[PDB]
Amino acid sequence: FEKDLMAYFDENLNRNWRGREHWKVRNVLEIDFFKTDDSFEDKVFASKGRTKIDMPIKNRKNDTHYLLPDDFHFSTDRITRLFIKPAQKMSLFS
Amino acid sequence: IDINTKIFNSVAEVFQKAQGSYAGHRKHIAVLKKIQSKAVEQGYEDAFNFWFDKLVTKILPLKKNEIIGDRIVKLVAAFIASLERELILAKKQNYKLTNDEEGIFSRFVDQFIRHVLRGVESPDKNVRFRVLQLLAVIMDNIGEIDESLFNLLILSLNKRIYDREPTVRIQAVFCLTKFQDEEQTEHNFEATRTLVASIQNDPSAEVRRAAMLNLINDNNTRPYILERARDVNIVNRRLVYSRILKSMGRKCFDDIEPHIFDQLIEWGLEDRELSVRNACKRLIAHDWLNALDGDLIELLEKLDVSRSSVCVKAIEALFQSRPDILSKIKFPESIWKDFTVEIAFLFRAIYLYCLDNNITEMLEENFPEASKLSEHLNHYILLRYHHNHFDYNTLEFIIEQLSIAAERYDYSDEVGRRSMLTVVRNMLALTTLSEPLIKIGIRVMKSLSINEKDFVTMAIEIINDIRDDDIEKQEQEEKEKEASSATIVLCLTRSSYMLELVNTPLTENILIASLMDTLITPAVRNTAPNIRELGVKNLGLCCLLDVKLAIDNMYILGMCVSKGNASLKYIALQVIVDIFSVHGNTVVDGEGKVDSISLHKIFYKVLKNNGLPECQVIAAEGLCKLFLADVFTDDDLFETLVLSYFSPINSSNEALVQAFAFCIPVYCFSHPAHQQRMSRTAADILLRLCVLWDDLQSSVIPEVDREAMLKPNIIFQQLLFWTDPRNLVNQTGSTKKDTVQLTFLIDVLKIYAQIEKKEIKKMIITNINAIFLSSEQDYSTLKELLEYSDDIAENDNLDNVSKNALDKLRNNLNSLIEEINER
DNA sequence: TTTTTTTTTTTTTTTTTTTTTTTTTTTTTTTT
DNA sequence: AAAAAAAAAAAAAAAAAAAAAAAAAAAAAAAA
């Protein structure tokens, strides 16, 4: 119930603060090929066919604008202390 | 052969030998210039473009992370750059625009862009990525183009910004940002709105890294850049300090509204990751201060030290960076009469940092003895408040900086202690003294007395003097016998910061009891807003010092948090949480006390109230802090806490979400019995959650507001992750024989026959294979899981993507049970 | 005619989240 | 109308991929 445990939490769950989603865990080729061939180009110049190469409509826009939320910090120092007296640490894990 | 093949073997040789180690690019670009010159002097220009496209299209299947294609795309980039610099030197002094190297360049780029944009629709990722790269690297040196070609390019790139893979979107935002020379005016031919749409909307955290730097950064687009200081990715948060703010440099003090300039450095110096903090520290420490020529005073005049209270961190990032300015700044005799706000803040920071590191040299010389600083303090206090340029806000700041300089000063001179005690006693007796100076004056009067008893009797003396000053003017001004409202406010604000710093029981400190029976108990029973608020706060700071007072007034705290307004419920909830947190559980469940079930119902009524956001936030943080301190052992309240984490009505309290994001994992990880409690609650949590998601998914409203709740697969994953006995923080060894995760899985398979939806069963059954499987478990906790998986696999009809995971768990359980009964 | 920066380019570290694997089911395509 | 058909979506799960910061190094331009 001392500095080692608090620092261990403060270093492992320090990337586990965003909330509901985004909780986090674990706390050759070398080709030289430039010589001729006739009809290779159609293997790389073709239309989309059945391969859909663009984005889904449901994720082209996002409403949170991929912002991090406002960081109410909630580290172990804010947990170990009181609210009306910020200079007293309580009987932690007692 | 003919020239159609001589050009082919030439370009083949140069693009083959230039594929390695960048060797001889000044010879490569040279011989490529000779063969393009001889080709256009011959006249096979479309054939030259065709073999160019041929030997380029022999590269386009090579992906990203391949150096051999990169050393050719940069070769042709160097080629078009060579033609561009030849035209730039041709328009100048000697008029080298001969042999039509403008027309050859224009037709060359008009044919080659038309070739590469034919390949932009191919289904392979590599050819699209290399086409948009081969445009984007050379788009800066392309220059002028045709309006039809510009329209085709902007249509292709405005479709490719919404391409499915991110690596081609990187080259898309590069080739977009090379088209930036316009006047900015906005509320699809403009690139800037497209880049802003990608800097907010794009799911890749890498496209923003190349849409964040390469933008124009004028007056209009700048918040769209700077709010990327709160980007999802860590590298973007560090890179806004690394390459955007460092790039502007001196213009950041005059081109950013100070509400954002006092927000960016707070977002930097209070981040959660070390590299972005170090980048903001090195930005406030190295680039800016060596950019305005070393003047610490000129930097502090632009870091607005009067309003923003963030600078007490940022100046520390100077003092831990280069100590030559720490040792260079000297405070002579002719500056204590003519302080400014910046140099008073500088003295504050340098003295408290010098006592933080205990450098005895700068404590010895270069700083005045305590009586001299007492003279300066009394000078500024009398020049502000004993009055009958020197604005009130600046004088208040100068007195507060020198009071923080005084609160940790050298006790060793008795003349200095005597002088500063007279100055603080003559300052805190002022009626019109402002509130932060009240706080820091009470702090100095604590930190310069001999003990806590002298500070108690001095503060009680000052507060009773300010009360007697009002009772005399109430007695005299007729020409009944109670103080006014404003003097009760001024007495309670001093009593708050006084009892903030007392750390002893109150049996031998009887002046606090006299203050309470005179003022605080007639402040709680009042009917004003602010008097009742400070009365409850002062009653709580008294209740953190004695237990009989807490057991007395917990009832009126509960009634005033159950039937009162917003701020009183705030302060009373903080006091209830803090009384529990200090005093343990002698506050409930006894004779004369409050019944704790009534307090749990009060906690319920606060916790289910969406209309009070911050009261719910402090209720959540409080109940989690009290669960960690093990004074709360109730079960249904923990069930309601985890539901309130996962409810959709509490999905707008961001602070409650972060409170439950931190303080529920530190519950179950810190102790095994806490994880056992989580595993006992998680069954009915998942049941009520699946019911709520079914009734939210089949609801018929034109604006339903769904998806606040997570999909229950991720809920089941995080329930497993909290209830996993690997991640316990203890050094146990026995934790490989705990059956809590399998008990949670057995309870989930029990409740699995209590849902109606056909997707819920799929995302419950497809995730049961993440459990702890090591054959060090008990016989029965494998036996019941084997029986329930048998009954669910046989008796109920399941689809194949669920029966895969279910019979895979059957195979793993059968292998482990064979290992169990082979011994 | 070799020297003295230039420079950029080119191999070690990190932890990031990011891509890739695999199973099955859906959803628009081909023929008479 | 109608009998087959295969890329995509969804998701669990795994490991290595890899942009970036920072140190050596070979081609290159001014120089006395």
- Please provide the DSSP assignment of A26-49 as one string: ------------SS-GGGTS---T
B536 alpha carbon, distance to own chain's centre:
33
DSSP state of B482: S
User: Which 291-320 residues of chain B approach strand C with CB closer than 7 Å?
Assistant: none
Q: Which domain holds residue B122?
A: 1-216
Q: How many CB atoms lie within 10 A of CB B132?
A: 29
Coil, strand or helix at B469: helix
Q: Is residue B243 part of a domain?
A: no
Query: At a CB cut-off of 8 Å and minimum separation 6, what does B648 contact?
Result: B692, B696, B705, B706, B708, B709
The residues with which B704 forms a beta bridge, in sequence order, are none
DSSP state of A70: P
The residues with which B594 forms a beta bridge, in sequence order, are B588
Rounded CA separation A88/B497 (Å): 14
Rounded CA separation A76/B666 (Å): 10
B566 alpha carbon, distance to own chain's centre:
27
Residues belonging to chain B:
823
What are the start-end ranges of the H helices in B214-272? Answer: 222-226, 234-242, 245-248, 258-269
SS (H, E, C) B694-722: HHHHCCCCCCCCCCCCCCHHHHHHHHHHH
Q: Which helix (H) or strand (E) holds B243?
A: none
Rounded CA separation B509/B561 (Å): 30
Query: At a CB cut-off of 8 Å and minimum separation 6, what does B506 contact?
Result: B512, B513, B542, B545, B546, B549
Rounded CA separation B757/B166 (Å): 36
Residue B297 and residue B335 in contact, taking contact as beta carbons nearer than 8 Å: no
Residue B601 and residue B607 in contact, taking contact as beta carbons nearer than 8 Å: no
Q: In this complex, which of A47, A71, A75 lies closest to B121 when CB atoms are compared?
A: A47
Q: Is residue B720 part of a domain?
A: no
Q: Is B331 left (phi over 0), alpha (psi -120 to 50) or beta?
A: beta
Determine the longest span between alpha carbons in chain A, in angstroms.
Answer: 81
Coil, strand or helix at A67: strand
Query: At a CB cut-off of 8 Å and minimum separation 6, what does B350 contact?
Result: B319, B326, B329, B362
Rounded CA separation B782/B785 (Å): 5
Coil, strand or helix at A54: strand
Instruction: Say what angle helices B435-447 and B414-427 make with each other, to 10 degrees.
Output: 150
Query: At a CB cut-off of 8 Å and minimum separation 6, what does B480 contact?
Result: B474
Residue B712 and residue B693 in contact, taking contact as beta carbons nearer than 8 Å: yes
- In chain B, % helix, strand, coil (3-state, to 5) comes to 65, 0, 30
Q: How many CB atoms lie within 10 A of CB B766?
A: 15
Q: In this complex, which of B19, B270, B714 lies closest to A73 when CB atoms are compared?
A: B270
Please name the nucleotide lying closest to B716, CA to C1': D12
Rounded CA separation A72/B270 (Å): 10
Smallest CA-to-CA distance from B521 within B536, B505, B506 is with B536
Buried b (16+ CB within 10 A) or exposed e, B321-345: eeeeebeeeeeeeeebeebbbbbbb
DSSP state of B62: -
Rounded CA separation B550/B553 (Å): 5
Q: In chain A, what residues touch B227 (CB-CB under 8 Å)? A: 67
Smallest CA-to-CA distance from B503 within B452, B468, B457, B553 is with B452
B270 alpha carbon, distance to own chain's centre:
7
Q: Which of A72, A77, A80, A89 best tests the B interface by mutation, with the highest count of B CBs <10 A?
A: A72
Smallest CA-to-CA distance from B623 within B609, B612, B639, B646 is with B639
Paired tokens of B812: 């793993």
Buried b (16+ CB within 10 A) or exposed e, B364-376: eeebeebeebbeb
B83 alpha carbon, distance to own chain's centre:
48
Q: Which residue shows structure tokens 């590269």?
A: B59
Rounded CA separation B504/B502 (Å): 6
- Sign, CA dihedral B418-B420-B422-B424, equals negative
The experimental technique behind this entry is cryo-EM
Rounded CA separation B244/B212 (Å): 9
- Residue-range domain boundaries for chain A: 1-94
Rounded CA separation B570/B533 (Å): 9
Q: In chain B, what residues touch A14 (CB-CB under 8 Å)? A: 272-273
Q: Is residue B114 part of a domain?
A: yes
Rounded CA separation B626/B140 (Å): 61
Smallest CA-to-CA distance from B75 within B114, B26, B13, B131 is with B26
Rounded CA separation B785/B816 (Å): 12
Phi and psi (nearest 5°) for A61?
-120, 155
- B731 burial via Cβ count (<10 Å: 0-12, 13-18, 19+): exposed
Rounded CA separation B667/B625 (Å): 9
Phi and psi (nearest 5°) for B231?
-75, 155
Q: Which residue shows structure tokens 């300010």?
A: B466
What are the start-end ranges of the H helices in B477-546? Answer: 485-499, 511-515, 521-524, 529-543
Chain A closest-CA separation from residue B72 CA (Å): 12
User: How far does the CA of B799 sit from the C1' of C25, in Å?
Assistant: 9
Residues belonging to chain A:
94
Rounded CA separation B337/B316 (Å): 26
Rounded CA separation B524/B541 (Å): 13
Rounded CA separation B471/B480 (Å): 9
Paired tokens of B284: 């406030």
Number of separate domains in chain B: 1
DSSP state of B168: H
DSSP per position, B293-338? TT-HHHHHTTTTTTT-TTHHHHTHHHHTT-THHHHH----GGGSSS
Smallest CA-to-CA distance from B730 within B654, B670, B677, B664 is with B670
Q: Is residue B93 part of a domain?
A: yes
Between the CA atoms of B301, B305, B307 and B312, what dihedral angle is there, to the nearest 10 degrees?
Answer: 160
B384 alpha carbon, distance to own chain's centre:
39
Q: In chain A, what residues touch B622 (CB-CB under 8 Å)? A: 83
Q: How many CB atoms lie within 10 A of CB B813?
A: 20
Question: C-alpha angle A83/A85/A90, rounded to 5°?
Answer: 80
Q: Which residue shows structure tokens 């933008």?
A: B215
Coil, strand or helix at B356: helix
Paired tokens of B618: 């402090």
DSSP state of B471: H
Rounded CA separation B151/B189 (Å): 8
Rounded CA separation B137/B135 (Å): 6
Q: How many CB atoms lie within 10 A of CB B470?
A: 18
CA nearest to A50 within chain B: B123
Chain-chain contact of B578 with A68 (C-beta, under 8 angstroms): no
Paired tokens of B310: 């963030």
Q: Is residue B132 part of a domain?
A: yes
Q: How many CB atoms lie within 10 A of CB B261?
A: 20
Q: Which residue shows structure tokens 């019941």?
A: B784
Q: Please, which positions of strand C sit below 7 A from a protein CB? A: 8-10, 16-19, 23-25, 29
Q: What letter represents residue B329's amino acid?
A: I
Residue B11 and residue B57 in contact, taking contact as beta carbons nearer than 8 Å: no
Residue B163 and residue B172 in contact, taking contact as beta carbons nearer than 8 Å: yes
B252 alpha carbon, distance to own chain's centre:
22
Buried b (16+ CB within 10 A) or exposed e, B34-51: ebbeebbeeebbebbbbb
User: How far does the CA of B209 sit from the C1' of C5, in Å?
Assistant: 34
Residue B102 and residue B87 in contact, taking contact as beta carbons nearer than 8 Å: yes
Rg (CA), chain A: 27
Query: At a CB cut-off of 8 Å and minimum separation 6, what does B75 contact?
Result: B15, B18, B25, B28, B29, B32
The residues with which B163 forms a beta bridge, in sequence order, are A54
